[PDB]
Design a protein around this ligand. Structure first.
Ligand SMILES: CCCCCCCC/C=C/CCCCCCCC(=O)O[C@@H](COC(=O)CCCCCCCCCCCCCCCCC)COP(=O)([O-])OCC[N+](C)(C)C
Ligand SMILES: CCCCCCCC/C=C/CCCCCCCC(=O)O[C@@H](COC(=O)CCCCCCCCCCCCCCCCC)COP(=O)([O-])OCC[N+](C)(C)C
Ligand SMILES: CCCCCCCC/C=C/CCCCCCCC(=O)O[C@@H](COC(=O)CCCCCCCCCCCCCCCCC)COP(=O)([O-])OCC[N+](C)(C)C
Ligand SMILES: CCCCCCCC/C=C/CCCCCCCC(=O)O[C@@H](COC(=O)CCCCCCCCCCCCCCCCC)COP(=O)([O-])OCC[N+](C)(C)C
Ligand SMILES: Nc1ncnc2c1ncn2[C@@H]1O[C@H](COP(=O)(O)OP(=O)(O)OP(=O)(O)O)[C@@H](O)[C@H]1O
Ligand SMILES: Nc1ncnc2c1ncn2[C@@H]1O[C@H](COP(=O)(O)OP(=O)(O)OP(=O)(O)O)[C@@H](O)[C@H]1O
Ligand SMILES: Cn1c(=O)c2c(ncn2C)n(C)c1=O
Ligand SMILES: [Ca+2]
Ligand SMILES: [Zn+2]
Ligand SMILES: [Zn+2]
Lengths: 694, 146, 49, 48
């Protein structure tokens, strides 16, 4: 592996048909027999690993202990028609058959899988690197064909990205994707987050912020993977292990509890349909269930208590699953503004940003970067702004002990962490907790869950309050949320047109009070008239209440204008109120909703169209890549796959800095400097070497 | 075929066959496709309509029951909101189909302590159910044509 | 998928499909890794025939 | 009709230069080429 790593280092910054790459191919050809032997070592045991697990092989295994004789092994392998004569004999020699010629094929298959994995992957990378940089060498395809199984095995783990290197050229980087990283990336919650992120940047995002948003998405996704790993499952100590297990259970099953609460709400409201009010006890009336089974009344009490418990568990499930991301994001953006902007050093927000003013409480807290990965943000800010703003003033702002900086760098102290609850009392950063709770209390999702719980408790005072919970279907079902989004999309316009409706009706009221009052007698009685327009407030209410809701406008409600001096004036008043209010203004309200359906629909189409016509990374259209058959499909899955950039960032974090290659160090340095110039923009490997590749 | 055989038991079953024009004529099938294109959304908004009407029923049963006497007779009242199931049916049956919402059907709220509360109940039910929710149903069909 | 298991061993499985030698091709492709006798049992094939 | 007019105006400004009329696709050969072109090379404010 170390020799191959040296060979891969010689290929750093190597152009297509480079002299070093062609020399390396000649070196492999000069030692072709040895290379074939090495490749024949890897595929034989990779094939052996899957053969022993095959159903046909198990038919030969007859020993109850799980062993197999050499003669039985001999007839098992040649029945697969995958190995030759000498190959089977070599496998027999490698098998540690006992004095009874019995072979433990379980350990035999797994004996070399782990020791030879690192070298096998690097050989696959070496052949892949040479093939893509010397594509017109007939001598190299022979090695690729002989290593087809090795390449196929490591295909899901061989990640490749393209970057703009320091040499002002597009370079292709090959790295390793671990099994855990790919498994976590394929989780449905992570995939849903990716779809939401893609929709946001394509719809309401810019080109200059596209890569910075993408990196921020990667940082959030990595943090969420840690949370999922922590909550996953395979006297103080006894309770703590059960407490975290209980909390993890709620975090894992947060959405099922949300569904369960919605189900219980319908069950409670179904029972409430049987309520009946009667003067007689089961001049005040009594409200009681009316059913013959006799089990619904106890069931309502049981469901009401159960619903309250589930709602309470949702809050605990939420603050252990979603709150850490909220704190992580807020700490992340605050730290960068402290360093790269000097938010509380230079600009000092002008009291109109409640978010900025609230974050002042956490600057001097000893545990400010609790969720954010960078634990040395204060150290970095001090080195950047200390000279221009004052080291002692920066330390006071960030709550840093300057005298403690050196002693920590000198040696390390190991104190006594007493596992007592009393010692745990004063170890709580009260100021940080106040800041953290303020962030949680300003979260829309947490406030909704809090309202759901409060309503559940009010349900115990009157059960009818459990009706409010049936609203949850607004966000419980995504189909309704999309439908309701068609109402809230133009919500501001809907409010204004209703306000405009109130003003136009007031103008009609003023005309009526002044000129048409006699026609507003709404009493069939003859000696006591119920005049509806003897007061402006009463007449305005009359127009807004019965006038708007009437099919034919105000004219339907008011007395006939026939045989009267003002008949023509009243026909204009009635027809104009019908047109302007009933016809035009109600069409605007309906028109806004209909237009919202079209506007939301094209946003989905626009996002889908952009993803299938342009690359998310380089921005080059699919038309250019389609010169080569299936060019755009291969480009978005192999060359500029956005998932590989996610994996490459995780690869750099786990890998030791001393082991970073020249290309890896270049990208890693720019990640720490927040410079996204390594992302290819408007260029790709295929475009840079069009003459050589074609 | 089954409906044709049932037609022999009662000839009126032969009416079902007139539905065939849905696929017999391609023009109608395209028109009907504009309804089934957003059929799932149409079902959900009707379900949403049932939930919003239930919330109005709960408010009525609790606070506005006196106004639900639908009997011109004076000694035997036909109270429509003395039971939740009856009151919910009343809102779903006459309330939704009324042009001006529930207010048109129920007794006038004038000269009463809860008059302002009842005007908000009547105007909001007109806006949310008659105006907004029926526009969504019509909006889904219109959007499907586009 | 579960309903199609009834037709795998039927003597006239490719009645309408033009390829009448699908069973022969499947046996040659998966017989070595899954067992020729087990494939024949699954597809209702007589190896001696 | 009014909605697409706003979209058309916004789309044209973000896809073509107001001065030379060359599309953003040509300038995007260079990373952030169109952004620099509309802020440094052919900025309409500089002509003012
Ligand atoms: C008010 C609803 C808030 C949310 C509105 C959305 C829901 C739409 C409609 C829902 C239906 C509501 C049920 C109404 C029927 C209840 C009748 C009743 O019990 O009326 C209650 C009135 O009491 C109350 O008002 C208590 C409620 C406190 C304040 C109510 C406001 C809710 C606060 C909301 C919390 C956060 C809200 C902020 C977010 C805004 C909304 C998102 C009287 O009893 P009762 O004595 O004779 O018996 C009790 C039996 N014993 C007395 C014998 C024990
Ligand atoms: C005379 C013809 C003018 C009517 C033109 C209508 C054009 C729009 C005008 C609207 C306001 C009309 C006020 C007229 C000013 C005074 C007229 C006069 O000389 O007044 C005339 C009476 O003529 C009339 O009856 C005019 C009747 C007007 C009815 C027109 C119906 C149109 C309603 C339009 C509602 C506006 C809402 C628009 C919303 C826009 C949404 C898109 C004689 O008085 P007077 O000695 O008995 O003592 C006034 C009475 N007070 C003692 C109370 C002061
Ligand atoms: C039920 C319709 C099914 C399809 C609905 C879509 C059509 C929309 C409406 C169509 C109009 C239907 C005509 C109703 C009037 C019939 C009155 C009548 O005869 O009512 C019948 C009721 O009997 C029945 O119900 C028999 C029918 C069996 C079950 C009916 C359900 C139909 C089964 C559907 C088969 C597959 C459906 C699955 C797909 C779903 C739909 C796509 C009674 O007689 P009658 O005794 O006095 O005389 C007979 C004269 N002698 C008795 C003297 C002989
Ligand atoms: C008091 C003002 C609160 C009204 C604010 C309305 C805002 C939304 C609230 C809706 C539910 C109202 C319940 C109020 C809680 C109890 C109030 C109270 O203290 O109750 C007050 C009475 O005040 C009232 O009359 C309030 C009347 C509310 C009418 C508001 C009409 C709006 C209808 C909205 C329908 C919701 C559907 C929304 C769908 C959304 C679709 C987009 C005194 O009791 P109580 O001693 O006689 O014994 C309670 C009676 N029981 C014995 C039966 C328990
Ligand atoms: N750089 C890119 N990386 C990945 N996909 C890209 C890129 N540029 C454009 N795309 C397009 O994004 C589309 C979305 O990816 P795709 O649908 O294959 O993802 P998935 O992981 O299989 O799951 P899902 O269907 O949920 O998105 C692809 O069809 C591809 O054409
Ligand atoms: N010649 C040009 N000069 C300026 N902007 C141009 C030119 N051609 C195209 N544009 C586009 O016009 C858009 C509008 O400019 P921009 O939004 O940056 O202006 P502003 O002064 O910051 O304020 P505002 O957001 O109110 O327009 C830019 O995003 C740019 O892409
Ligand atoms: C240690 N570390 C980093 O160094 C890092 C990062 N994201 C970016 N960087 C640079 N994450 C998530 C991280 O854990
Ligand atoms: Ca090194
Ligand atoms: Zn690309
Ligand atoms: Zn220009």
């Amino acid at each position: 592996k170390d020799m191959v790593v040296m060979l891969l280092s010689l290929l750093e910054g190597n152009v297509v048909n480079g002299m070093i790459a062609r020399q390396m191919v000649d070196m492999l050809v000069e030692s072709s027999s040895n290379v074939e032997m090495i490749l024949k070592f890897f595929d034989m045991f990779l094939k052996l690993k899957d053969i022993v697990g095959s159903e046909a092989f198990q038919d030969y295994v007859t020993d109850p202990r799980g062993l197999i004789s050499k003669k039985d092994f001999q007839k098992a392998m040649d029945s697969q028609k995958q190995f030759t004569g000498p190959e089977i004999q070599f496998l027999l020699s490698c098998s540690e058959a006992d004095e009874n010629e019995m072979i433990n094929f379980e350990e035999f298959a797994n004996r070399f899988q782990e020791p030879a994995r690192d070298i096998g992957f690097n050989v696959a990378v070496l052949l892949t690197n040479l093939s893509e940089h010397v594509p017109h060498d007939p001598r190299l395809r022979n090695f690729l064909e002989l290593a087809e199984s090795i390449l196929e095995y490591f295909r899901p783990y061989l990640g490749r990205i393209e970057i703009m290197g320091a040499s002002r050229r597009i370079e292709r980087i090959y790295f390793e994707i671990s099994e855990t990283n790919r498994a976590q990336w394929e989780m449905p919650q992570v995939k849903e987050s990716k779809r939401q992120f893609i929709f946001d940047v394509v719809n309401e995002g810019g080109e200059a912020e596209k890569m910075e948003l993408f990196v921020s998405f990667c940082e959030d996704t990595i943090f969420e993977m840690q949370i999922a790993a922590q909550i996953s499952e395979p006297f103080w100590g006894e309770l703590e292990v059960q407490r975290v297990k209980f909390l993890n259970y709620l975090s894992r099953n947060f959405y099922t509890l949300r569904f369960l609460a919605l189900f219980l709400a319908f069950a409670i409201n179904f029972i409430l349909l049987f309520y009946k009010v009667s003067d007689s006890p089961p001049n005040m009336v009594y409200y009681f269930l009316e059913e013959s089974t006799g089990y619904m009344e106890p069931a309502l009490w049981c469901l009401s208590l159960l619903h309250t418990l589930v709602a309470f568990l949702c809050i605990i499930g939420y603050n252990c699953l979603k709150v850490p991301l909220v704190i992580f994001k807020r700490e992340k953006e605050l730290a960068r503004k402290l360093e790269f902007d000097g938010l509380y050093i230079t600009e000092q927000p002008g009291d109109d940003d409640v978010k900025g003013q609230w974050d002042r409480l956490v600057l001097n807290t000893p545990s400010f970067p609790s969720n954010y990965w960078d634990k040395f943000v204060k150290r970095k800010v001090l080195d950047k702004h200390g000279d221009i703003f004052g080291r002692e003033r920066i330390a006071e702002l960030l709550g840093m002990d300057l005298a403690s900086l050196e002693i920590t760098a000198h040696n390390e102290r190991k104190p006594d962490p007493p596992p007592g609850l009393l010692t745990w009392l004063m170890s709580i950063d009260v100021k940080y907790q106040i800041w953290k709770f303020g962030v949680i209390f300003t979260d829309n999702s947490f406030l909704y869950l809090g309202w759901y719980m409060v309503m559940s408790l009010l349900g115990h005072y009157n059960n009818f309050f459990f009706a409010a919970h049936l609203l949850d279907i607004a966000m419980g079902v995504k189909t309704l949320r999309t439908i309701l989004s068609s109402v809230t999309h133009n919500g501001k316009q809907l409010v204004m047109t209703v306000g405009l409706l109130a003003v136009v009706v007031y103008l009609y009221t003023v005309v009526a009070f002044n000129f048409f009052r006699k026609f507003y007698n709404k009493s069939e009685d003859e000696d006591e008239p119920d005049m509806k327009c003897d007061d402006m407030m009463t007449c305005y209410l009359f127009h807004m209440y019965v006038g708007v809701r009437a099919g034919g406008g105000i004219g339907d409600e008011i007395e006939d204008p026939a045989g009267d001096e003002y008949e023509l004036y009243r026909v204009v008043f009635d027809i104009t109120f019908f047109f302007f209010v009933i016809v035009i203004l109600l069409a605007i309200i309906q028109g806004l909703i209909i237009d919202a359906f079209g506007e939301l629909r094209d946003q989905q189409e626009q996002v889908k169209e952009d993803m299938e016509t342009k690359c998310f990374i380089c921005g080059i259209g699919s038309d250019y890549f389609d010169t080569t058959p299936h060019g755009f499909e291969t480009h978005t899955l192999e060359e500029h796959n956005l998932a590989n950039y996610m994996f490459f960032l995780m690869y750099l974090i786990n890998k030791d800095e001393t082991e970073h290659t020249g290309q890896e160090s270049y990208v890693w340095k720019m990640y720490q400097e927040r410079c996204w110039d390594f992302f290819p923009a408007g260029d790709c490997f295929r475009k840079q070497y069009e003459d050589q590749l074609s």
